[PDB]
Amino acid sequence: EEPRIGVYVCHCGVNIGGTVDCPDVTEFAKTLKNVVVARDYKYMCADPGQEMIKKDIKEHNLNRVVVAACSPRLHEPTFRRCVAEAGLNPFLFEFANIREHCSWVHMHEKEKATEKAKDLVRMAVAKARLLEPLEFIKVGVTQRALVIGGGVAGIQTALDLGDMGFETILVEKTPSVGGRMAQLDKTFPTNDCSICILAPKMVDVAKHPNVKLYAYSEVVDVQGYVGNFKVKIMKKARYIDETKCTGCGQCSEVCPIDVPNEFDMGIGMRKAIYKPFPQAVPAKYTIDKEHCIECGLCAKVCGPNAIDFDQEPEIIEAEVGTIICAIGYDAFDPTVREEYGYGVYDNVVTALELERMINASGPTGGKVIRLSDGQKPKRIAFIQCVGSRDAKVGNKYCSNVCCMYAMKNSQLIKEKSPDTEIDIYYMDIRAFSKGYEEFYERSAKQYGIKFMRGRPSQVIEDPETGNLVVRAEDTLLGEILEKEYDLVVLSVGMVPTKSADEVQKILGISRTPDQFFMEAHPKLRPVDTATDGVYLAGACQGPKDIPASVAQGSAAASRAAIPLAKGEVEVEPIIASVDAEICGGCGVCVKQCPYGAPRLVEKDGKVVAEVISALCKGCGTCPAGCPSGALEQDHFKTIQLFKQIEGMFRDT
Amino acid sequence: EEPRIGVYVCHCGVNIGGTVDCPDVTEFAKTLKNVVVARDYKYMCADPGQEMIKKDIKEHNLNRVVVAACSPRLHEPTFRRCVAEAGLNPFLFEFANIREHCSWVHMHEKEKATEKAKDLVRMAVAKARLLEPLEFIKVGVTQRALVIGGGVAGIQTALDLGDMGFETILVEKTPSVGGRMAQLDKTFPTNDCSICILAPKMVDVAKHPNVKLYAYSEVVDVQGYVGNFKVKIMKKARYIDETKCTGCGQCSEVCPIDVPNEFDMGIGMRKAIYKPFPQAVPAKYTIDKEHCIECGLCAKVCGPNAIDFDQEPEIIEAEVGTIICAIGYDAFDPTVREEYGYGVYDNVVTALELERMINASGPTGGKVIRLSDGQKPKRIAFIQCVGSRDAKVGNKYCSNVCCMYAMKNSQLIKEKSPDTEIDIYYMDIRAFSKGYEEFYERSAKQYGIKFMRGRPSQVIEDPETGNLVVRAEDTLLGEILEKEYDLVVLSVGMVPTKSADEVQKILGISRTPDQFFMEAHPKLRPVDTATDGVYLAGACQGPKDIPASVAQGSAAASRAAIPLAKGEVEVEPIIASVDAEICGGCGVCVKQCPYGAPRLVEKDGKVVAEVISALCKGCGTCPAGCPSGALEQDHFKTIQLFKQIEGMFRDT
Ligand SMILES: Cc1cc2nc3c(=O)[nH]c(=O)nc-3n(C[C@H](O)[C@H](O)[C@H](O)COP(=O)(O)OP(=O)(O)OC[C@H]3O[C@@H](n4cnc5c(N)ncnc54)[C@H](O)[C@@H]3O)c2cc1C
Ligand SMILES: Cc1cc2nc3c(=O)[nH]c(=O)nc-3n(C[C@H](O)[C@H](O)[C@H](O)COP(=O)(O)OP(=O)(O)OC[C@H]3O[C@@H](n4cnc5c(N)ncnc54)[C@H](O)[C@@H]3O)c2cc1C
Ligand code: SF4
Ligand code: SF4
Ligand code: SF4
Ligand code: SF4
Ligand code: SF4
Ligand code: SF4
Ligand code: SF4
Ligand code: SF4
Ligand code: SF4
Ligand code: SF4
Ligand code: SF4
Ligand code: SF4
Ligand SMILES: [Fe+3]
16 A cells, blocks of 8 residues: 655644744645645644644544654653554554754744755655554563662652562662762751661661571672663672671671761771671671781681671572662762862861761761861861862753752751851852751741852861861952851762762663763653663752652652553564565574574575564664665664665655 | 569660660660560661660560660661561550650750759559550552543653552543643753653553553542542543543534633633643543533534533542652742732743643744733843742742753743843752753753853833833842843742642652651652552652652552552551450440441440541540540550559659
């Protein structure tokens, strides 16, 4: 049968129509071979727009549909479901991107944008003619979830999925769950003890009947697709018998190697054999082989003889249906902003280091003290937006929680020592959520915390006393201030965690300009990724506070529970297949596939290649490399792409 | 059985110990009758502290445990689980608050604070002796959910629950779903049309096999408890047969009565027979009997003969297990800030009215025009924080979205008319989330939008031209500005919706100081309420944007899916019960219960009262009002409270 194409040009209100002359593109589409219906509408994805396509498919007997509008990455599934409801196979639908790829980037070149939209429509129509009906492949869903990261976001996802009755696996990189929330003393805007409220959730997730906790473990490999993921978890060796470990801590006293305690942000010193924090879950000790000298002094003191250097990491193979990435964030390193002197001046600290100094279980015993002489500071300055809203460090985003934690920690210091003078150097006070503006009012009115509108130019240390001078313009007075302080606290921003690169490659997910993980859509899908079966939750998706991370943890559980609850999902049949009559078994395709899908086999007395359909992810590398043309990727066949290329210059 | 009490005095590091002499309180606890074990520890909620109680329950055969520490509102579940793990019934545990109620508020009166701690311990020990072992009530869960409000948040909850396989009911007050998002033209920070994200979701929810949509309907009654709610939905009469209606709108072109369109904020004119907006769902019409003259002109053009003036509202009785409140918000009415002249000056508009003016399907055809002469403004001023961060109007909170929508609408006006001059009068620019700070940078750098740091004192109209003058101090220059504008846009804040009072009474939920709905906990249960089985999602819980409302919608689906998935939930046994041997059926208790749990019945030939256990919420009002003493609330019995009162002055 000959193609009967329906072309739809969206205006997207004025997003497309305001730059591209949609009525003119619609008239041009009609001049193309096989195009029998062409219409322009304000919103093609809206009810009237979708009903218009369906009605035309039936009335004009269309076997191809072209929608010139937004990106397929946003509404391709939406229009595929729309055409399928009218009886048209979803793979006979073609998208032409004239918004993100045209109207939004050629706003001052309307005529050339209109001509580009015509060519993009002709290219879409050209490929559409040779598109073929493909059967959406129905695949089963393994009734099991995987959560990567055991912070407040990850713990919430696992608890929600576990409570729903779904088997869940929670992998935590460090020896304990809890994340950065465990490092905080209190939490704004209620000033609740962070661990005193998080600990119950850590306890709950550790003994949940539907949650398998793998602490001090890392996901080293993920293979497959939605509902059929095959994951490899490396249970790292603590070199201490897990079951015989009491958690008393007497073998550390003899260890001669001092390692900076990561949990205390480098202020504290721990041994090669240790426990992250006193309320850690699971409560067990670990040996760090990156700094261990293997002298065996700890083993002599240890009664249980739990210490075993011959311990080997275990690779656990698990099958899951959905994966939730909740690996969190890291604090920005302010060494780069040299004018502030971090790493040079002893009394210049970050806010996360202050959290630890303020924390009762911290290295200073909950006492805020100068690192140069151990004395309590009488005057403190907070410097906002350090590593945020700054093009010089490549971080042009708002870290979201720094205004609030600076005001919170200032209240905690005033509670401990009311005589302390505290000044906050800011640009904008961002107290945007429930009880936040009130917290800001309270900080000034009740605690006497002072606010200076002006981003400091530099910090100068007095080498004789260790005191610091903050140079900044009080923009509200139009005068330069040069106030002296005993301690300067840099309100550092949030950056993706160090392991984010490793996790990105394993899950096959993208990043946003801020370097955090990319959600499928900022409003249509805040916790989904463009990779089916992979979701996000917490700070790893972008800078945010606890309730936002907790809500995202719950949102991810719901979204990841949909495929599990359904028990069946549909996958794109854009896979490679070999034409046995043309393949002479050259073997070029075999090594090109990273999944090992194409394999040489015997057929009709001779050798030929054959693709294991289930192992093909549909990249199109082996068909591109096939020298005989026997290998072809459905939906991206060479002939289809060839006509698309012709479509840019002429009607084919 | 004789009470064997274990008393534990927490130091909370120095939070309690630094004011209260804990060792002295422990010595005093030992002098009380039945106290077998008394110990003081740094952190009672920590692993060593919890294990110390468990070990003592076993080794000293305790049948009562008293913990003198912080608030039960913080660690009551924690210590309940701790004692239950040692075999002790959780209702034989008593909490004494010596931190929030003593050490933290009597810091300068240590001696009196220690004597207060001793009395609080004696009061706890006194009640503890008469505490009894109790068991939780297990109840079934109806496999069905109810969502109130069909905005982006409510639609997301219903779609997620439906996709999970749970039957869901979505009740929408107005004739169409979509909410305030439907009124917006574009949406920050992507500047997508609001329709781009919302319409497909509206279409999906309207034809979902697991979602029953009741548009133009309201919940009039809710009875029961978690997993056993009995709801009454009033399907308001549209006076049109929905199944016969096509939604063509031939009727609207004939109707002679003009009613102000509520959807366009009074700026638009609709007919008696109307459709809220062109992309409305369901695509059906509605007759407003408040303004219909019943001429029957619309019925003559209606082909399928759907119009029926004899339509009566239907009361639908439905049984649900969980309820999600997503009723949204209303825009603040700026008439009260009289210095700005809203409702007095024709060219002073709200931001929500501007959304309708800018919208292509709006009353002005997407043209921003002055309401005094219909001309397009060349100079526009945006006034931030109108009805927010203001004690004079009783709204001391940040409305969260006004900074971003002002910058977004300014970008949109610049796109339609680049010659337009736009100034934004602000205090703090709150662009706190992903891509928000970048959107703010873009507004100034790309669109040339100007920012004036200064909250305007007043707006003065020129009665002769209709132009407005904005009086404000440019705080960054220390000079007073008196710039003239063609249009002044008030960036109005968010307030709870008008129906919020009705919904609050029906669901039995609380409100936070901002008047929005109260979540169970700000940090860990952001979408739950203290009322089991009732959840929140969207702007009705607090001012927030679409990404946050969508994530909350998904978070609520997950949380509301837990009881449904479990199929069984537990209810607290701290309920009222009647002692049949003492009750002579006086009937005083019956009308005191707002849930109607206590009921009169015939037993052994005589009248006696009986409480329906599942219906009791545990307030203790009817036992307090019982004149015979037959009615008692377990855990708060009169004898228990009597001993507690004695405990303040003496032992026992
Ligand atoms: C100084 C400061 C003060 C703050 N104060 C407050 C406050 O008062 N109130 C508030 O609400 N918020 C505050 N915040 C924000 C708060 O820290 C975050 O909201 C919160 O930690 C988010 O939790 P998360 O689970 O998403 O990530 P995280 O807390 O960082 O946890 C991530 C977890 O994943 C693990 N992980 C990382 N990589 C891997 C991997 N490859 N495999 C397995 N596991 C991995 C980590 O070890 C960690 O346990 C503050 C932030 C800072 C920096
Ligand atoms: C001028 C303006 C511009 C904005 N611009 C943006 C933007 O660009 N980007 C962005 O992200 N956010 C923006 N916002 C915020 C955005 O409007 C909200 O985030 C969003 O509408 C919240 O969705 P919701 O469902 O929670 O509330 P709503 O949109 O208000 O939905 C509530 C729904 O419940 C229904 N309802 C009410 N009462 C009852 C009842 N008793 N029974 C049944 N149903 C009921 C209502 O009719 C309504 O349909 C803007 C807000 C304003 C005022
Ligand atoms: S390794 Fe031995 S000494 Fe160290 S905590 Fe474990 S049991 Fe105690
Ligand atoms: S063997 Fe390793 S952990 Fe043990 S004492 Fe020596 S360096 Fe420390
Ligand atoms: S939240 Fe406050 S301190 Fe943090 S980057 Fe944004 S404006 Fe700066
Ligand atoms: S590359 Fe082409 S010809 Fe060679 S073995 Fe593979 S399918 Fe056959
Ligand atoms: S197209 Fe070829 S190389 Fe790519 S995943 Fe499929 S079989 Fe492997
Ligand atoms: S039990 Fe309460 S008072 Fe004692 S350490 Fe814990 S939080 Fe602080
Ligand atoms: S989202 Fe796509 S189809 Fe919908 S109105 Fe915007 S451009 Fe058109
Ligand atoms: S009531 Fe009749 S005329 Fe009006 S839209 Fe419905 S079908 Fe058309
Ligand atoms: S009968 Fe009512 S709805 Fe119909 S045209 Fe007359 S006023 Fe309008
Ligand atoms: S978001 Fe902006 S305009 Fe709105 S109340 Fe907060 S600071 Fe004021
Ligand atoms: S008030 Fe007391 S005595 Fe009277 S009916 Fe109720 S339980 Fe019986
Ligand atoms: S104690 Fe309160 S809720 Fe319970 S039966 Fe009596 S009045 Fe009703
Ligand atoms: Fe505690």
